[PDB]
């Protein structure tokens, strides 16, 4: 199964609160249950360093999570892809400085 980048573009999914998605499961899996009654990443990071010969920080984020959000350009109607890495300090990155961007002006 080869890697297809356009999956992540058309993928129907995103991040969520997921708090009630844990509690949904415990009132799920008890139902049911009462009827009855060195990480891998470091090896990957050492996988390249074996076949690379260098850390190559550009690759290190590629081994991490990568957020790909498809957008459209009002001028050309065409597409431009907004990306926020996992360790990226910029918007969308899991490491970011508060305050962050809010829709308060826009949504109203």
């Amino acid at each position: 199964p080869p890697i297809s980048p356009e999956e992540q573009l058309t993928a129907p999914g995103g991040d969520t609160a997921t708090a009630e998605d844990v509690s949904i499961t415990q009132e799920n899996e008890e139902i049911l249950a009462l009827v009855q009654r060195r990480s891998l990443v470091e090896w990957l990071d050492r996988g390249w360093e074996a076949l690379a010969g260098g850390d190559r920080p550009d690759w290190l984020w590629s081994r991490r999570s990568i957020s790909v959000v498809l957008r459209h350009h009002y001028g050309t109607k065409q597409r431009f892809v907004v990306v926020s890495y996992e360790n990226s300090v910029a918007w969308g990155g899991r490491r970011a400085r508060p305050p962050r961007l809010s829709s308060e002006l826009a949504t109203a």
Partner: protein, 43 residues
């Protein structure tokens, strides 16, 4: 001078539709994971 603004907004509006096209496409999958796990419970 009008037709430009008149033209420009037509392209802009259809763009956000495809911004909304993926948005609406979420709801059918939003339905399953909020229902399908409830089924085996009652089963």
């Amino acid at each position: 001078e009008r037709a430009a603004v008149l033209q420009a907004q037509r392209t802009a509006a259809a763009a956000a539709l495809e911004n909304a096209a993926l948005q609406a496409a979420e709801l059918p999958v939003d339905i399953e994971r909020r229902i399908r796990p409830i089924e085996q419970q009652v089963h």
